[PDB]
Amino acid sequence: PFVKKHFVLVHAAFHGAWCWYKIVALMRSSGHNVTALDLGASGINPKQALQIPNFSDYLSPLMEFMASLPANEKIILVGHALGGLAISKAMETFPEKISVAVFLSGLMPGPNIDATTVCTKAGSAVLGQLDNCVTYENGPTNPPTTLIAGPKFLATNVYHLSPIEDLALATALVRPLYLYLAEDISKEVVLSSKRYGSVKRVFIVATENDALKKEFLKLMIEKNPPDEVKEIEGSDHVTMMSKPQQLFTTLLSIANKYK
Amino acid sequence: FVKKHFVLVHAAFHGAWCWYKIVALMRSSGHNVTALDLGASGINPKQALQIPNFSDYLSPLMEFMASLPANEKIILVGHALGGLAISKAMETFPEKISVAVFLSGLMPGPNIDATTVCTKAGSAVLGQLDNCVTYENGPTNPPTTLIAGPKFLATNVYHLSPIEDLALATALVRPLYLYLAEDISKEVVLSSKRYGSVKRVFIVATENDALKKEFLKLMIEKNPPDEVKEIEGSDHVTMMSKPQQLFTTLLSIANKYK
Ligand SMILES: CCCCCCCCCC(=O)O
Ligand SMILES: CCCCCCCCCC(=O)O
């Protein structure tokens, strides 16, 4: 009783559609439709970070994709980490086009724990970490403009349990992230219980995530309870790299449950 | 154990990312490796329409080569179209290169022009399957860029590679500006005293394509390298289909021409 589904994958900071390559392959081989998107200035998106200081422009690729979805079509929307904010806005805007939303170690703000709160905590876990650095394209009087992930940070905090070739891949592809302002994010991502909250939600925890500590993740799960919490043991931050098969099986299960 | 420095240059539509398996093997083995993105390739910031001159496309490699102190020799590896890039680097900084390696690369020489090799190579890409061209300069002008299609990648390029690598490529390949023959001919000028002074190895890595192999054989005949090596079971992207084999071959070459 095969039922073709449409998975939409949204990456985390510094990454792009490319990070989902193992999952995309498994999905396509299964006969499912899968769309891996590059958010603004990510992957091979043409914009450069400094060219998109407005958060709406970082999210535009997903919003535009959602708006173009055929009528009556439902998707399984998956967001990894920072990608959680993107799918959250998609849920609030197009709740009817989403069968179920999946937050993979994702920022999952809610009415009782808004985006600014989540982003501030998220920032503290990345800014200043190991060899990560910021730039000041607008001068020292202004806030730092972009954040650049360093190879040591990637090796230790993100890809510690992934094949070494995936770390090499990431080092050749990660791009800078514009340090979006708190006020800008708070105005772009506003969630309501009747829209955002009406979409089925599942959170997937990576048990060995050294990028985002469990306390923070548990905080979001507690202050904004999802319909279900799944766990993938032995996974580092990039579950799609370290535990691809398990993630795939888990996504299929989720898709069949909320179809 | 002597530490070596490998510099890897990709083919059309690709970028530094395509060498990820090789980069990992080299780094874990203790060697230094630099995989470069040519213009408008991988995460290079330029877009194809911004680099209409072949010199613009080669810029990343030439800037890198210029930054190398003469005593820091490298093993320069070029894949397919990347052969033209390393050829230019060989003519400009011949002494900084211990040995140049052409992996199924376009290897023009005095007896076989760069435009000649480009036209031939392009025949197997232009108009193939779902590949397409754009006309950013209007319909009354030659096409401006070439875009590799998914079916073309699956059937002609990644046909012997893991399916996940095909997925990776589909999410990363970028358009190639259709450089003019006149431009290429002016940019890639080689001399026996400079280009010809660099040790050169050609790696034949093709399968199921007699014509492609005939083309590689033609270049080897018209521009004889110092040595020719083979890698079997490889599709267009040897670094994806036969990584361990390519890695060991590059190390063998490096240890020989040191
Ligand atoms: C809006 C800027 C906030 C900083 C980004 C911190 C999130 C790191 C998580 C990730 O996406 O892998
Ligand atoms: C740069 C001049 C345009 C050449 C035509 C395209 C050939 C691509 C060859 C390759 O890497 O397989």
Coordinates of C-alpha atoms and ligand atoms in Angstrom, one line a residue:
Chain A
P1 CA 0.0 0.0 0.0
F2 CA 2.6 2.5 -1.1
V3 CA 1.5 6.2 -0.6
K4 CA 3.7 8.7 -2.3
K5 CA 4.6 11.6 0.0
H6 CA 6.4 14.9 -0.4
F7 CA 9.2 15.7 2.0
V8 CA 10.5 19.3 2.2
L9 CA 13.9 19.6 3.9
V10 CA 15.1 22.9 5.4
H11 CA 18.8 23.2 6.5
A12 CA 20.4 24.9 9.5
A13 CA 22.8 27.9 9.8
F14 CA 25.8 27.9 7.4
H15 CA 24.5 24.9 5.5
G16 CA 22.3 24.3 2.4
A17 CA 20.2 21.8 0.5
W18 CA 23.4 19.8 0.1
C19 CA 23.6 18.6 3.7
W20 CA 20.5 16.4 3.1
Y21 CA 22.1 14.4 0.3
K22 CA 22.0 11.1 2.0
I23 CA 18.3 11.5 2.9
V24 CA 17.4 12.9 -0.5
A25 CA 18.9 9.8 -2.1
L26 CA 17.0 7.4 0.1
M27 CA 13.8 9.3 -0.5
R28 CA 14.1 9.4 -4.2
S29 CA 15.1 5.7 -4.4
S30 CA 11.9 5.0 -2.4
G31 CA 9.7 6.8 -5.0
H32 CA 8.9 9.7 -2.7
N33 CA 9.1 13.3 -3.8
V34 CA 11.6 15.4 -1.9
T35 CA 12.6 19.0 -2.1
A36 CA 15.8 20.2 -0.4
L37 CA 15.8 24.0 -0.3
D38 CA 18.7 26.5 0.0
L39 CA 17.6 29.4 2.2
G40 CA 19.0 32.9 1.5
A41 CA 22.8 33.0 0.9
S42 CA 23.0 29.3 1.6
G43 CA 24.3 26.5 -0.5
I44 CA 24.2 27.7 -4.1
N45 CA 21.6 30.4 -3.5
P46 CA 22.9 33.5 -5.5
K47 CA 22.5 36.0 -2.7
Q48 CA 25.5 36.9 -0.5
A49 CA 25.0 37.2 3.2
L50 CA 25.7 41.0 3.3
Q51 CA 23.1 41.4 0.6
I52 CA 20.2 40.0 2.7
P53 CA 20.2 41.8 6.1
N54 CA 16.5 41.3 6.4
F55 CA 15.3 38.0 7.9
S56 CA 12.4 37.8 5.4
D57 CA 15.0 37.5 2.6
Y58 CA 16.7 34.6 4.4
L59 CA 13.4 32.8 4.5
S60 CA 12.1 33.9 1.1
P61 CA 13.1 30.6 -0.7
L62 CA 10.9 28.6 1.6
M63 CA 8.0 31.0 1.7
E64 CA 8.0 31.3 -2.1
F65 CA 8.1 27.5 -2.4
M66 CA 5.2 27.1 -0.1
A67 CA 3.2 29.7 -2.0
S68 CA 3.7 27.7 -5.2
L69 CA 2.6 24.4 -3.9
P70 CA -0.2 22.8 -5.9
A71 CA -3.7 23.0 -4.4
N72 CA -4.7 20.2 -2.0
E73 CA -1.1 19.0 -1.7
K74 CA 0.3 18.3 1.7
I75 CA 3.9 18.1 2.7
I76 CA 6.1 16.7 5.5
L77 CA 8.1 19.8 6.5
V78 CA 11.4 19.1 8.1
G79 CA 13.6 21.8 9.7
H80 CA 17.1 21.3 11.1
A81 CA 18.1 23.7 14.0
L82 CA 17.9 27.3 12.8
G83 CA 15.7 25.8 10.0
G84 CA 13.1 25.5 12.8
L85 CA 12.3 29.2 12.6
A86 CA 11.8 29.0 8.9
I87 CA 9.3 26.1 9.0
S88 CA 7.6 27.8 12.0
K89 CA 6.8 30.8 9.8
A90 CA 5.6 28.4 7.1
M91 CA 3.3 26.7 9.6
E92 CA 1.8 30.0 10.6
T93 CA 1.3 31.1 7.0
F94 CA 0.4 27.9 5.2
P95 CA -0.9 25.6 8.0
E96 CA -3.3 23.8 5.6
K97 CA -0.4 22.7 3.2
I98 CA 1.5 20.9 6.0
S99 CA 0.6 17.3 7.0
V100 CA 3.2 17.4 9.8
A101 CA 6.2 19.5 10.8
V102 CA 9.4 17.9 12.1
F103 CA 11.9 19.8 14.2
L104 CA 15.3 18.0 14.0
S105 CA 17.2 19.5 17.0
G106 CA 15.4 22.5 15.7
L107 CA 14.6 25.9 17.2
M108 CA 11.0 25.4 18.1
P109 CA 9.6 28.7 19.4
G110 CA 6.0 28.9 20.5
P111 CA 3.4 31.4 21.9
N112 CA 5.0 30.8 25.4
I113 CA 8.6 30.9 24.2
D114 CA 9.0 33.3 21.2
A115 CA 11.7 33.4 18.5
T116 CA 13.9 36.1 20.2
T117 CA 14.2 34.0 23.3
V118 CA 15.1 30.9 21.3
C119 CA 17.5 32.8 19.0
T120 CA 19.3 34.5 21.9
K121 CA 19.9 31.1 23.6
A122 CA 20.9 29.7 20.3
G123 CA 23.4 32.5 19.6
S124 CA 25.1 32.0 23.0
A125 CA 25.8 28.4 22.0
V126 CA 27.4 29.3 18.7
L127 CA 29.0 32.8 18.9
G128 CA 32.4 32.7 20.5
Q129 CA 32.6 28.9 20.2
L130 CA 36.1 27.7 19.3
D131 CA 37.2 29.2 16.0
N132 CA 33.9 30.8 15.0
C133 CA 34.3 34.5 14.2
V134 CA 32.2 37.5 13.4
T135 CA 32.7 40.4 10.9
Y136 CA 32.0 44.1 11.2
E137 CA 31.1 45.2 7.7
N138 CA 29.1 48.1 9.1
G139 CA 31.9 49.4 11.3
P140 CA 32.6 49.0 15.1
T141 CA 29.7 51.3 16.1
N142 CA 27.3 48.8 14.7
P143 CA 26.5 45.1 15.6
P144 CA 28.6 42.4 14.0
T145 CA 27.3 41.7 10.5
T146 CA 28.0 38.0 9.9
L147 CA 29.0 34.8 11.7
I148 CA 31.4 32.4 10.1
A149 CA 31.6 28.8 11.3
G150 CA 35.2 27.6 11.8
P151 CA 36.5 24.1 10.9
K152 CA 37.4 23.3 14.5
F153 CA 33.9 24.3 15.6
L154 CA 32.4 22.0 12.9
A155 CA 34.7 19.1 13.8
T156 CA 34.0 19.3 17.5
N157 CA 30.5 20.7 18.0
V158 CA 28.7 19.6 14.9
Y159 CA 30.3 16.6 13.0
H160 CA 32.0 14.8 15.8
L161 CA 30.1 11.5 15.2
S162 CA 30.0 11.8 11.3
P163 CA 32.2 10.2 8.7
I164 CA 35.4 12.4 8.2
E165 CA 34.5 12.9 4.5
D166 CA 31.3 14.7 5.6
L167 CA 33.4 17.1 7.7
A168 CA 35.6 17.7 4.6
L169 CA 32.4 18.3 2.5
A170 CA 31.0 20.8 5.0
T171 CA 34.3 22.7 5.3
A172 CA 34.2 23.2 1.5
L173 CA 30.5 24.4 1.5
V174 CA 29.5 26.2 4.7
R175 CA 28.8 29.9 4.2
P176 CA 28.5 32.9 6.5
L177 CA 25.2 33.7 8.3
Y178 CA 24.0 37.2 8.6
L179 CA 23.5 38.1 12.2
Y180 CA 19.8 38.9 12.0
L181 CA 18.5 41.3 14.6
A182 CA 16.3 40.3 17.4
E183 CA 13.6 42.8 16.6
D184 CA 13.6 41.7 12.9
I185 CA 13.2 38.0 13.8
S186 CA 10.5 38.7 16.4
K187 CA 8.4 40.5 13.7
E188 CA 8.9 37.8 11.1
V189 CA 8.1 34.8 13.2
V190 CA 4.9 35.3 15.2
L191 CA 3.0 32.2 16.0
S192 CA -0.7 31.7 17.0
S193 CA -2.2 28.6 18.6
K194 CA -4.9 28.3 15.9
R195 CA -2.6 28.4 12.9
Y196 CA 0.9 27.3 13.9
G197 CA -0.5 25.3 16.8
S198 CA -3.0 23.5 14.6
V199 CA -0.2 21.7 12.6
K200 CA 0.9 18.3 13.8
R201 CA 4.4 18.6 15.2
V202 CA 7.2 16.1 16.0
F203 CA 10.5 16.9 17.6
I204 CA 13.5 14.7 17.0
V205 CA 16.3 14.7 19.6
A206 CA 19.9 13.8 18.6
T207 CA 21.1 12.2 21.9
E208 CA 24.7 13.2 21.4
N209 CA 24.2 16.8 20.1
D210 CA 27.1 18.9 21.1
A211 CA 26.0 22.0 19.3
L212 CA 22.8 22.6 21.1
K213 CA 22.7 21.2 24.7
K214 CA 19.8 19.0 25.9
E215 CA 18.7 21.6 28.5
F216 CA 17.9 24.1 25.9
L217 CA 16.2 21.6 23.7
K218 CA 14.2 20.2 26.6
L219 CA 13.3 23.8 27.5
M220 CA 11.6 24.3 24.1
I221 CA 9.9 20.9 24.3
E222 CA 8.5 21.8 27.7
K223 CA 7.4 25.4 27.0
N224 CA 6.0 24.4 23.5
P225 CA 5.0 20.7 23.7
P226 CA 4.9 18.9 20.3
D227 CA 2.5 16.0 19.5
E228 CA 5.4 13.6 19.9
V229 CA 9.1 13.5 20.7
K230 CA 11.4 11.0 19.0
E231 CA 15.0 10.2 19.7
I232 CA 17.9 9.1 17.5
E233 CA 20.7 7.6 19.6
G234 CA 24.4 8.2 18.7
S235 CA 23.6 11.2 16.5
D236 CA 25.6 14.4 16.6
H237 CA 24.1 17.7 15.5
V238 CA 24.0 16.7 11.8
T239 CA 21.7 13.6 12.1
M240 CA 21.4 13.6 8.3
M241 CA 25.2 12.9 8.2
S242 CA 25.8 10.7 11.2
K243 CA 22.6 8.6 11.4
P244 CA 21.0 8.9 7.9
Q245 CA 19.2 5.5 7.7
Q246 CA 17.7 5.9 11.1
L247 CA 16.6 9.5 10.3
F248 CA 15.1 8.2 7.1
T249 CA 13.2 5.4 8.8
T250 CA 12.0 7.8 11.4
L251 CA 10.8 10.3 8.8
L252 CA 8.9 7.6 7.0
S253 CA 7.2 6.5 10.2
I254 CA 6.2 10.0 11.1
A255 CA 4.9 10.5 7.5
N256 CA 2.7 7.4 7.7
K257 CA 1.4 8.2 11.2
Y258 CA 0.1 11.7 10.4
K259 CA -0.8 11.2 6.7
Chain B
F1 CA 57.0 10.1 5.3
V2 CA 57.3 13.4 3.4
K3 CA 54.4 15.7 3.6
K4 CA 53.1 16.8 0.2
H5 CA 50.7 19.5 -0.9
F6 CA 47.9 18.5 -3.4
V7 CA 45.9 21.2 -5.1
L8 CA 42.7 19.9 -6.7
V9 CA 40.9 21.6 -9.5
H10 CA 37.4 20.5 -10.5
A11 CA 35.6 20.2 -13.9
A12 CA 32.7 22.1 -15.4
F13 CA 29.6 22.8 -13.2
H14 CA 31.4 21.4 -10.1
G15 CA 33.4 22.8 -7.3
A16 CA 35.8 22.0 -4.5
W17 CA 33.0 20.0 -2.9
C18 CA 33.3 17.2 -5.5
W19 CA 36.7 16.2 -4.1
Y20 CA 35.4 15.7 -0.5
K21 CA 36.3 12.0 -0.4
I22 CA 39.8 12.6 -1.7
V23 CA 40.3 15.6 0.6
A24 CA 39.3 13.4 3.6
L25 CA 41.8 10.6 2.6
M26 CA 44.6 13.1 2.1
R27 CA 44.1 15.0 5.4
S28 CA 43.7 11.8 7.5
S29 CA 47.0 10.6 5.8
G30 CA 48.9 13.7 6.9
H31 CA 49.1 15.6 3.7
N32 CA 48.1 19.1 3.0
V33 CA 45.3 19.6 0.4
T34 CA 43.7 22.5 -1.2
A35 CA 40.5 22.0 -3.2
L36 CA 39.6 25.2 -5.0
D37 CA 36.4 26.6 -6.4
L38 CA 36.9 28.2 -9.8
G39 CA 34.8 31.2 -10.8
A40 CA 31.1 30.9 -10.1
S41 CA 31.7 27.3 -9.0
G42 CA 30.8 25.8 -5.6
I43 CA 30.5 28.6 -3.1
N44 CA 32.6 31.1 -5.2
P45 CA 30.7 34.4 -4.8
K46 CA 30.6 35.3 -8.5
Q47 CA 27.6 34.4 -10.7
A48 CA 28.3 33.0 -14.2
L49 CA 27.2 36.2 -16.0
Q50 CA 29.7 38.2 -13.9
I51 CA 32.7 36.2 -15.3
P52 CA 32.4 36.2 -19.1
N53 CA 36.2 36.2 -19.6
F54 CA 38.0 32.8 -19.2
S55 CA 40.6 34.6 -17.1
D56 CA 37.8 35.4 -14.6
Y57 CA 37.0 31.7 -14.4
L58 CA 40.6 30.8 -13.7
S59 CA 41.2 33.6 -11.2
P60 CA 40.9 31.5 -8.0
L61 CA 43.6 29.2 -9.1
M62 CA 45.9 31.9 -10.5
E63 CA 45.5 33.9 -7.3
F64 CA 46.3 30.8 -5.2
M65 CA 49.3 30.0 -7.4
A66 CA 50.6 33.5 -7.0
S67 CA 50.4 33.3 -3.2
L68 CA 52.7 30.3 -3.1
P69 CA 56.4 30.9 -2.1
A70 CA 58.5 29.3 -4.9
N71 CA 59.9 26.8 -2.5
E72 CA 56.5 25.3 -1.6
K73 CA 56.0 22.9 -4.5
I74 CA 52.6 21.3 -5.2
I75 CA 51.1 18.4 -7.0
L76 CA 48.5 20.0 -9.3
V77 CA 45.5 17.9 -10.2
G78 CA 43.0 18.9 -12.9
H79 CA 39.8 17.0 -13.8
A80 CA 38.2 17.3 -17.2
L81 CA 37.7 21.0 -18.0
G82 CA 40.0 21.6 -15.0
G83 CA 42.8 20.6 -17.3
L84 CA 42.7 24.0 -19.1
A85 CA 43.1 25.7 -15.7
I86 CA 46.1 23.7 -14.6
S87 CA 47.6 24.1 -18.0
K88 CA 47.5 27.9 -17.6
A89 CA 49.0 27.6 -14.1
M90 CA 51.8 25.4 -15.5
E91 CA 52.6 28.0 -18.1
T92 CA 52.6 30.8 -15.5
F93 CA 54.2 29.2 -12.5
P94 CA 56.0 26.1 -13.9
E95 CA 58.7 25.9 -11.2
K96 CA 56.1 25.8 -8.3
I97 CA 54.7 22.5 -9.6
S98 CA 56.4 19.2 -8.9
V99 CA 54.0 17.4 -11.2
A100 CA 50.7 18.1 -13.0
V101 CA 48.1 15.4 -13.1
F102 CA 45.3 15.4 -15.8
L103 CA 42.5 13.2 -14.6
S104 CA 40.6 12.6 -17.9
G105 CA 41.5 16.2 -18.3
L106 CA 41.6 18.4 -21.3
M107 CA 45.3 18.5 -22.0
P108 CA 46.1 20.9 -24.8
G109 CA 49.6 21.2 -26.1
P110 CA 51.6 22.7 -29.1
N111 CA 50.1 20.1 -31.4
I112 CA 46.5 20.2 -30.2
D113 CA 44.9 23.6 -29.4
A114 CA 42.9 24.4 -26.3
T115 CA 39.9 25.4 -28.6
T116 CA 40.3 22.1 -30.4
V117 CA 40.0 20.1 -27.1
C118 CA 37.2 22.3 -25.8
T119 CA 35.0 21.9 -28.9
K120 CA 35.4 18.2 -28.8
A121 CA 34.7 17.9 -25.0
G122 CA 31.7 20.2 -25.4
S123 CA 30.1 18.0 -28.1
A124 CA 29.5 15.3 -25.4
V125 CA 27.8 17.9 -23.2
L126 CA 25.9 20.5 -25.3
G127 CA 22.5 19.3 -26.3
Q128 CA 22.9 16.1 -24.3
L129 CA 19.8 14.7 -22.6
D130 CA 18.3 17.4 -20.3
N131 CA 21.2 19.8 -20.5
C132 CA 20.2 23.3 -21.5
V133 CA 21.5 26.8 -22.4
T134 CA 20.5 30.3 -21.5
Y135 CA 20.4 33.4 -23.6
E136 CA 21.2 36.3 -21.2
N137 CA 22.5 38.3 -24.1
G138 CA 19.3 38.0 -26.1
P139 CA 18.0 35.4 -28.7
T140 CA 20.1 37.0 -31.5
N141 CA 23.3 36.2 -29.6
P142 CA 25.1 32.9 -28.8
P143 CA 23.9 31.1 -25.7
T144 CA 25.5 32.6 -22.6
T145 CA 25.5 29.7 -20.1
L146 CA 25.2 25.9 -20.0
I147 CA 23.3 24.1 -17.3
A148 CA 23.8 20.4 -16.4
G149 CA 20.5 18.6 -16.1
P150 CA 19.6 15.9 -13.5
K151 CA 19.2 13.1 -16.1
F152 CA 22.4 14.0 -17.8
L153 CA 24.2 13.8 -14.5
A154 CA 22.6 10.5 -13.7
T155 CA 23.2 8.9 -17.0
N156 CA 26.5 10.3 -18.4
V157 CA 28.4 11.5 -15.3
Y158 CA 27.5 9.7 -12.1
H159 CA 26.4 6.4 -13.6
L160 CA 29.0 4.4 -11.6
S161 CA 28.9 6.4 -8.3
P162 CA 26.8 6.0 -5.2
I163 CA 23.3 7.3 -5.6
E164 CA 23.8 9.8 -2.7
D165 CA 26.6 11.4 -4.7
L166 CA 24.2 12.0 -7.6
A167 CA 21.9 13.7 -5.1
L168 CA 24.7 15.8 -3.7
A169 CA 25.6 16.9 -7.2
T170 CA 22.1 17.8 -8.2
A171 CA 22.0 20.2 -5.2
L172 CA 25.3 21.8 -6.1
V173 CA 26.1 21.9 -9.8
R174 CA 26.1 25.5 -11.1
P175 CA 26.0 26.9 -14.7
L176 CA 29.1 27.3 -16.8
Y177 CA 29.6 30.4 -18.9
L178 CA 30.0 29.4 -22.5
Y179 CA 33.4 31.0 -23.1
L180 CA 34.3 32.1 -26.6
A181 CA 36.9 30.1 -28.6
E182 CA 38.7 33.3 -29.3
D183 CA 39.0 34.1 -25.6
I184 CA 40.1 30.6 -24.6
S185 CA 42.7 30.5 -27.4
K186 CA 44.2 33.8 -26.2
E187 CA 44.2 32.8 -22.5
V188 CA 45.6 29.3 -22.8
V189 CA 48.9 29.8 -24.7
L190 CA 51.5 27.2 -23.8
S191 CA 55.3 27.0 -24.5
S192 CA 57.7 24.1 -24.5
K193 CA 60.1 26.0 -22.3
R194 CA 57.5 26.7 -19.5
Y195 CA 54.5 24.4 -19.8
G196 CA 56.6 21.7 -21.4
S197 CA 59.1 21.8 -18.5
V198 CA 56.6 20.6 -15.9
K199 CA 56.4 16.8 -15.2
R200 CA 53.0 15.6 -16.5
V201 CA 50.9 12.5 -15.8
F202 CA 47.6 11.6 -17.5
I203 CA 45.1 9.3 -15.8
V204 CA 42.7 7.6 -18.1
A205 CA 39.6 6.9 -16.1
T206 CA 36.6 6.1 -18.3
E207 CA 34.2 3.2 -18.7
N208 CA 31.5 2.3 -21.3
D209 CA 32.5 5.2 -23.5
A210 CA 34.7 4.2 -26.4
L211 CA 34.5 7.6 -28.1
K212 CA 35.4 9.4 -24.9
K213 CA 38.3 7.1 -24.6
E214 CA 39.3 7.8 -28.2
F215 CA 39.3 11.5 -27.4
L216 CA 41.6 11.0 -24.4
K217 CA 43.8 8.8 -26.5
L218 CA 44.0 11.5 -29.2
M219 CA 45.2 14.1 -26.6
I220 CA 47.8 11.7 -25.2
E221 CA 49.0 11.1 -28.8
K222 CA 49.2 14.7 -29.9
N223 CA 50.6 15.9 -26.5
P224 CA 52.5 13.0 -25.0
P225 CA 52.7 13.2 -21.2
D226 CA 55.6 11.8 -19.1
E227 CA 53.4 8.9 -18.0
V228 CA 49.9 7.5 -18.5
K229 CA 48.0 5.7 -15.7
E230 CA 44.6 4.0 -15.7
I231 CA 41.8 3.6 -13.2
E232 CA 39.1 1.1 -14.1
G233 CA 35.4 1.1 -13.2
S234 CA 35.3 4.9 -13.2
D235 CA 32.5 7.1 -14.6
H236 CA 33.1 10.8 -15.3
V237 CA 33.7 11.6 -11.6
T238 CA 36.5 9.3 -10.6
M239 CA 36.7 11.1 -7.2
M240 CA 33.2 9.9 -6.5
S241 CA 33.2 6.4 -8.1
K242 CA 36.8 5.3 -7.4
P243 CA 38.0 7.5 -4.5
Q244 CA 40.4 5.0 -2.8
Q245 CA 41.9 4.1 -6.2
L246 CA 42.3 7.7 -7.2
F247 CA 43.8 8.6 -3.8
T248 CA 46.4 5.8 -4.0
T249 CA 47.2 6.7 -7.6
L250 CA 47.8 10.4 -6.7
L251 CA 50.1 9.4 -3.8
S252 CA 52.0 7.0 -6.0
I253 CA 52.5 9.9 -8.5
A254 CA 53.5 12.3 -5.8
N255 CA 56.1 10.0 -4.4
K256 CA 57.6 9.4 -7.8
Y257 CA 57.8 13.0 -9.1
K258 CA 59.0 14.6 -5.8
Ligands
LIG1 C1 19.8 34.3 13.8 C2 21.2 34.0 14.3 C3 21.3 33.1 15.5 C4 22.5 32.3 15.6 C5 22.5 30.9 15.0 C6 22.5 29.8 16.1 C7 21.8 28.6 15.7 C8 22.8 27.5 15.5 C9 22.0 26.3 15.1 C10 22.2 25.7 13.7 O1 21.5 26.3 12.9 O2 23.0 24.8 13.4
LIG2 C1 35.0 26.6 -20.9 C2 34.5 26.5 -22.3 C3 33.2 25.7 -22.4 C4 33.5 24.2 -22.7 C5 32.2 23.4 -23.1 C6 31.8 22.5 -21.9 C7 32.8 21.4 -21.6 C8 32.6 20.9 -20.2 C9 33.6 19.8 -20.1 C10 33.8 19.0 -18.9 O1 34.2 19.4 -17.8 O2 33.3 17.9 -19.0

